[PDB]
Amino acid sequence: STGSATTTPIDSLDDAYITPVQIGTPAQTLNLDFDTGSSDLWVFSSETTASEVDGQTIYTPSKSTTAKLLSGATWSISYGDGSSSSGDVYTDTVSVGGLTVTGQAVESAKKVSSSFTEDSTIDGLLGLAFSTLNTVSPTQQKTFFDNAKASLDSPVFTADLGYHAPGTYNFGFIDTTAYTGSITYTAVSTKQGFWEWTSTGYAVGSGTFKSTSIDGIADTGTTLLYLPATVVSAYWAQVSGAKSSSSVGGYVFPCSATLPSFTFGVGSARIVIPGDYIDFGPISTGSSSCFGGIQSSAGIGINIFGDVALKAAFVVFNGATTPTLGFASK
Numbered sequence: 001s002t003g004s005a006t007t008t009p010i011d012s013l014d015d016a017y018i019t020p021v022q023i024g025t026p027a028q029t030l031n032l033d034f035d036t037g038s039s040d041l042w043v044f045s046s047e048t049t050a051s052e053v054d055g056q057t058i059y060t061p062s063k064s065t066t067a068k069l070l071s072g073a074t075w076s077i078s079y080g081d082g083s084s085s086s087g088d089v090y091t092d093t094v095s096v097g098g099l100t101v102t103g104q105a106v107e108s109a110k111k112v113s114s115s116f117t118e119d120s121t122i123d124g125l126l127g128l129a130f131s132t133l134n135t136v137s138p139t140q141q142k143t144f145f146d147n148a149k150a151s152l153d154s155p156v157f158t159a160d161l162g163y164h165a166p167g168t169y170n171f172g173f174i175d176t177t178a179y180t181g182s183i184t185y186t187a188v189s190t191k192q193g194f195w196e197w198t199s200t201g202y203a204v205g206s207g208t209f210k211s212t213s214i215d216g217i218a219d220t221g222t223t224l225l226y227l228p229a230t231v232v233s234a235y236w237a238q239v240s241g242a243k244s245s246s247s248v249g250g251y252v253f254p255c256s257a258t259l260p261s262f263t264f265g266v267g268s269a270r271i272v273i274p275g276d277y278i279d280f281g282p283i284s285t286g287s288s289s290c291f292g293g294i295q296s297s298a299g300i301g302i303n304i305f306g307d308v309a310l311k312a313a314f315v316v317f318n319g320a321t322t323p324t325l326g327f328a329s330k
Helices: 144-151 229-236
Strands: 003-009 017-023 028-035 041-043 068-078 084-096 099-112 124-127 156-160 167-171 184-187 196-204 210-218 225-227 243-245 250-254 262-266 269-273 279-282 289-292 294-296 303-305 314-318 324-328
Touching (some): 003 084, 099 144, 184 196, 196 229, 210 225, 229 250, 250 294
Parallel strands (some): 028 124, 041 099, 210 303, 225 294
Antiparallel strands (some): 017 028, 017 084, 068 084, 156 167, 156 314, 184 324, 196 210, 196 262, 225 303, 243 250, 250 289, 262 269, 279 289
């Protein structure tokens, strides 16, 4: 089997991407944030505290003939951005882009943090990191991909995120028309539960390439590119007027600037992030200070190849017995 679904930016900045997901019988379609940095499929629901729901579409398990309470199971998650959610668990039928999993753990939110409530466009998350990170207790549950894997034509999914445009998540096949050149594959460590890999270096603009190992995670659920402070400083030093603002919470730059590209290495291959991808617009409406899309990972504890980086590539998440990651230009 295979599946193919379009993923759509939630706003004009590509702050996140939503993908329609069919849950239950008859189908209830919710728009979920596919997140390769976590491993829970959780949804706003009929059980979510009413004051914490503001415009989201909810899953109502009582209206699904295939829903079954997973008795005794609870979940609770906190994300790297400080947001959180928790609740109980149902199993139900879940389909993405024509690919159907029966018995998928659907984690129903009883509580969500402010950040989720305030974002009307995201109805929940669909985790695509390794199932060892799943928070369901006392019986850890498998991700959608893990459940689908054996049925897939090939044990892979691909992320093809658009810049200011829709893109595609495919399951079970590699669309050879979706990228240019060849795909370069690179080793993955699953020791922390992430799609963790080592970039071979970087360049700023038309500058020379610096060969240096950068360990980080491929994370579709993080907006920006978070890298070591050395790398980030070297980038922003090429933008006149750019500075790190402790009050704003990262590097800002004059909105009048033209940003240089940023290149990262995948083996001997190179992915180029155009300068425009690194512009996240005014820090507040009407401001002439703009927020940068490359930020320091210092104090996160890990480097994160978020959407800024991933959207510059066609990315293969290879879930074979020894997982690997593939990157191609497009």
